[PDB]
Amino acid sequence: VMREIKVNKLVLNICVGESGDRLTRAARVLEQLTEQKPIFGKCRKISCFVTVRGKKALEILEKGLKRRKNFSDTGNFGFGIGMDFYVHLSRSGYRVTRRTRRRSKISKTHKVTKEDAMKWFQTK
Amino acid sequence: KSRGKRSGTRYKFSKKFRKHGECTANKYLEKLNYGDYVDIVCDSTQQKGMPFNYYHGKTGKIFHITKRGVGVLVNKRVKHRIEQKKVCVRIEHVRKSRCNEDFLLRKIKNAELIKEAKLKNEHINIKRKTEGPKPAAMIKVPPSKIITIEPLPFY
Amino acid sequence: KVVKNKAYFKRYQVKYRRRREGKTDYRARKALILQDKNKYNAQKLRFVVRKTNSQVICQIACAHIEGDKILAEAKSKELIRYGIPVGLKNYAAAYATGLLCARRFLKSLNLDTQFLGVEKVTRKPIKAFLDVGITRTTTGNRVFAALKGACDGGLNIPHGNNRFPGSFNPEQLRKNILGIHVAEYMKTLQEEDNDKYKTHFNDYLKNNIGADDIEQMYLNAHEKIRQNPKKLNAKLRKKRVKEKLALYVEKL
Amino acid sequence: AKSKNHTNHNQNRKAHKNGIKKPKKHKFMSRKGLDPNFFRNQKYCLKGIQKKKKELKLKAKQEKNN
């Protein structure tokens, strides 16, 4: 089939909570980790985070591999090291909930759920 | 003390339950010609071209047609006399009136009816029949279903 | 709490069917179909361009109360008989489909000889307005390829020049209309790695086309398209729930 | 001192004493502020009609009165 659970998205998060200097350094570390520019948080500017996909995401997750509760009921997970990994994984066909023209919802048969997410984590 | 434009229109100018949202695209295809009748039903979703409170639910004749608006002559009662008022609205707030639809259908139906009757040279009465007293009827009912009725006691 | 409450369902108002399906905008639609009420019997033709991920389609529509009437219609799959056997989703295919719709419409109206359109690719004509169709209108979108095709076919479709590939680049427009970008992708893929090239343009090879023949197969396609345009009722429901209840008595 | 602020008493019967007069509803209405570029073209239409009629009338009158 095509029911395989792939890493849809991996998001690195750095919540510094203050102004620049340290925020710019936190941007630099995310830059060297992944060659794409980061994005800053709220300006109520307090955090930097970036999104990666595909082979780079898989390699970064492999580097971060170094628990069976950090899994969400919707079938995602994350951890920390200082910085935060969060991987949202899904089956193929997730496009139908994100595309503009015929946007719709996948059935819970197609949704990943925590059991399948755990099994995928142990298999990878 | 307070007499603004939309004063008193809390309920009249509110969309009905589960009937909110802009008008259907089909409303813009409604054909309007000069001199035909029209109802003024304010559509609160469209704020421009909105008629005054009084004219909601009034029928008038078209006297002017613009690119997106209609001018309609409406009778308004002002103390001791009626007078025509030229109300200018947008097309969303106006709707073709069925006030004379039976008249138009009657005109066509009677046209063909009296055409065929005059062909067969019969003098026919064409006016509406204002039905009144019904004739006698010799009607039989099976006695197995004639129910006797008595007033009921109190409980 | 539950948000999907019975009260929530009671108070819910559904969108229009086509909005729920994500087909029509319903704001662009009425801005497109609304005509001045001074103008009586003014049709306001709409040139609908819709691109599936298999082929593009173009049609001429006139809005009517009972439902739109389609006066002309062309699909990219018709280019098989006009000599284009592959790439029915290209900028070039969209151009050709628009050309087909325009020429066929004019032929149905008996107006080809009075509206020849342009020759090759650099009384008032029929006026139609382009219908977007949800797609984002970036510079280089194929809807404007189809619009250019219909303008070259002879229809008057009002448009700016800002959305052709390049914000104006007539040469780039021409090369995309003849699919020179597809040919150039073929060249680069062949030069760098033949395996990716032959796994990407597999059906192109199976058609024995040339990266140097994409152009010509589009030009002669243009000339030869110009030259010739189940149900269950309460009884069964009751009986079936009776038997399901009787079964659930023993099994569970 | 204090007085009656307002009343509509007797107003309806005053209104009906001389009846509720209706608008006259004349056959023609002024086109002054109505649809320019349509009523101007109607002016041109009518001028053409009048000239075409009047030249026939002049021809017939001249040929019947020598």
Next chain:
RNA sequence: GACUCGUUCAUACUACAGUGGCCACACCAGAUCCCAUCAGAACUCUGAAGUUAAGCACUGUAAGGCUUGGCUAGUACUGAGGUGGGAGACCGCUCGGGAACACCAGGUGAUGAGUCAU
């Protein structure tokens, strides 16, 4: 058997299931080019290796909702009359009009123009 543009705007929605794909819709492969971002996710472009898992279509549920009919009920309320009753609150009679919530039952769509495939 499908698609595009529509109409009606829940009998059309929602949840959970089951079934299905000649072309067809799609998911899907990719990022040189137009274009696009933190991110080819989206959008845009170029494809045709895979797949009905999903979207999509059809069906099911003593399903919710919606809709129709019944019943609530000539009940509530109400127009006109009364030198009617009653201390009053209120309540009849005469000539008329007539609900709602709830509950019960059936149903869960229909359709205009054009086109593809066989």
Next chain:
RNA sequence: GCAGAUGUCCAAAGACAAGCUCAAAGAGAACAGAAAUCUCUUGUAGACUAAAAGGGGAAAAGCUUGUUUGAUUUCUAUUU
């Protein structure tokens, strides 16, 4: 009479277009906690829309962005 509001405010909070969807909840992630940021799910508006209150609004009338000055000159038919 009752509950209130007005003598303002705005080069954007005006104009147009595009993209996006809000409040809130739940689950999950180093520091990080009832609250910081990030991810998913549900989400008919329970947000926002300068201000009183009432209407209207979801591929918007809300949010973000881009370009702007139609907050321009003149004149009608008119509504309150």
Next chain:
RNA sequence: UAGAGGACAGGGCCUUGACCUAUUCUCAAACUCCCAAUAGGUAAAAAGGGCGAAAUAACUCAAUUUGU
């Protein structure tokens, strides 16, 4: 206003609550899914309507003959 059933907080498996689900007693001039009676509006043909031809126009339309 009352209880009934149930996976977070607290104390000693228990209890207190919170919260959730289905119920329950009672209400609104500035509440409304629904919704009367009465009151209100428009129409019910001749200076008009229907159906055709022929003219006119600088309007409208792709249309010197589309439409009005």
